[PDB]
Amino acid sequence: GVDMGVDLKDIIPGEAKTVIEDLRILHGKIIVIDGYNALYQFLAAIRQPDGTPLMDNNGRITSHLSGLFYRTINIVEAGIKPVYVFDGKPPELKAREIERRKAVKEEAAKKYEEAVQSGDLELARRYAMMSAKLTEEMVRDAKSLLDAMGIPWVQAPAEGEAQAAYIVKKGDAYASASQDYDSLLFGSPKLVRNLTISGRRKLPRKNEYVEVKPELIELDKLLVQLGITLENLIDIGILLGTDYNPDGFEGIGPKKALQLVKAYGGIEKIPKPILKSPIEVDVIAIKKYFLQPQVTDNYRIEWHTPDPDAVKRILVDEHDFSIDRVSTALERYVKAFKENIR
């Protein structure tokens, strides 16, 4: 999927992650899913055959709603009790997400150009795929859809990932779920990755597939295996770049950041020439914020009876989804809801 936050993928040791064979292993668990990250995953992963986003008859992108609908159904059918958490700020004002999007686009543009120049139509099509912007209206529609589906969501005061971590800390969910690792930095005991994108994706040749499986990462286990403190982990994130310093530090990737924090016991002792930043950054204040982020006790996670007609109105009437496909999915969803949620 797409990295919209702090990506630590290639520094996670094997001993710190557990491959989940399929969704059903997590049956009965409450999973708190970061809202913006999931919507970004759906925006990138759900496409027409040629790579164009799904669109309604008014020309509006619908990929995020399609993902949210069908993936949430699958999660429920697996026996998982999902709850989404949405950021206190609109997605237009999420500095790291915007910086991440810009970086992906710049990289894709360079690769598209190379593919055109080399005459590779297959790569061209891949690198041509546009990175859709998540807007406040799309977030509003996502919330409305979840309401119609009877799926709870929590309004975070600030970072969605921080609130997700806090819900897990409180024992109100088993794990947070996202493609980025932000929730671990915010102290989540358990992160599940790939939940929004798991399954089999068809490759170029006839019977070829890539298998993406969900994975569990436990915080205290990660910290021990890496031989680092939570403050060290947060500092790694700061070197890579947060909402409070979206560009991070020039030339520093995840392996290097990990090496540096370990060698100097944090950021402040790293020799100054190593760290190059466009603007001066209060790295200590950012760390202390990650340790005690703005989060709330003011939530109550409850699942309600799905409202099939309301789902139809949103997807079919307002967004031109197929009535057959939506109705068939709803039939299955209401049954699985009754059985798995109550």
Side-chain angles (χ1 to χ4, degrees), residues 78-309:
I80 293 158
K81 300 183 172 163
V83 50
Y84 285 84
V85 54
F86 290 101
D87 206 276
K89 292 306 167 61
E92 298 90 339
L93 303 177
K94 290 290 285 173
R96 177 65 170 187
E97 288 175 356
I98 289 158
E99 182 275 345
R100 290 331 274 170
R101 185 184 166 273
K102 179 130 171 280
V104 158
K105 284 170 52 67
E106 287 180 17
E107 176 62 19
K110 154 185 139 80
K111 300 300 283 183
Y112 177 78
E113 169 150 36
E114 289 169 340
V116 165
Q117 209 179 336
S118 83
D120 197 317
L121 180 50
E122 199 67 28
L123 285 172
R125 197 149 56 255
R126 186 186 315 172
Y127 296 127
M129 276 177 64
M130 67 161 279
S131 306
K133 290 169 181 173
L134 181 63
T135 74
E136 178 57 22
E137 170 178 21
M138 295 156 65
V139 172
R140 178 164 303 112
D141 293 341
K143 289 169 178 177
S144 295
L145 176 63
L146 297 167
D147 293 349
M149 296 178 70
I151 302 293
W153 58 267
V154 170
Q155 184 52 69
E159 294 89 350
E161 298 283 356
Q163 185 65 36
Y166 186 72
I167 293 165
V168 185
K169 282 184 191 190
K170 294 306 276 169
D172 289 330
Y174 171 75
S176 47
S178 181
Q179 291 313 107
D180 61 38
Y181 292 76
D182 301 25
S183 71
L184 294 172
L185 275 39
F186 286 125
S188 177
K190 290 189 166 60
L191 168 68
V192 171
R193 296 182 74 252
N194 304 150
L195 200 78
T196 58
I197 60 162
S198 59
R200 307 161 70 27
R201 40 187 305 201
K202 328 95 214 150
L203 285 159
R205 207 162 86 265
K206 46 182 177 178
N207 292 113
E208 305 257 314
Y209 291 94
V210 248
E211 182 75 32
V212 184
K213 292 174 181 167
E215 65 184 15
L216 168 70
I217 299 154
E218 297 168 287
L219 178 57
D220 281 349
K221 213 165 184 188
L222 172 61
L223 296 175
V224 173
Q225 284 305 308
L226 283 182
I228 62 172
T229 63
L230 177 58
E231 284 189 23
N232 293 343
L233 186 67
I234 290 168
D235 276 355
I236 292 165
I238 292 168
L239 290 182
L240 299 181
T242 68
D243 280 332
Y244 305 99
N245 71 313
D247 298 325
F249 294 82
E250 301 168 25
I252 301 170
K255 291 174 184 181
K256 181 64 149 173
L258 168 69
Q259 219 173 27
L260 292 177
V261 167
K262 289 174 86 175
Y264 298 99
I267 290 171
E268 286 306 11
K269 289 175 157 192
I270 297 176
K272 305 289 165 201
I274 303 302
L275 301 184
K276 319 169 187 181
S277 196
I279 190 72
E280 168 68 296
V281 180
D282 191 342
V283 299
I284 297 176
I286 298 168
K287 179 180 73 177
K288 295 183 178 307
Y289 177 78
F290 271 75
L291 290 169
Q292 301 201 82
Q294 194 64 47
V295 290
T296 185
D297 287 320
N298 179 33
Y299 61 83
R300 177 142 171 232
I301 304 160
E302 293 178 340
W303 294 264
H304 303 300
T305 306
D307 182 347
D309 195 76

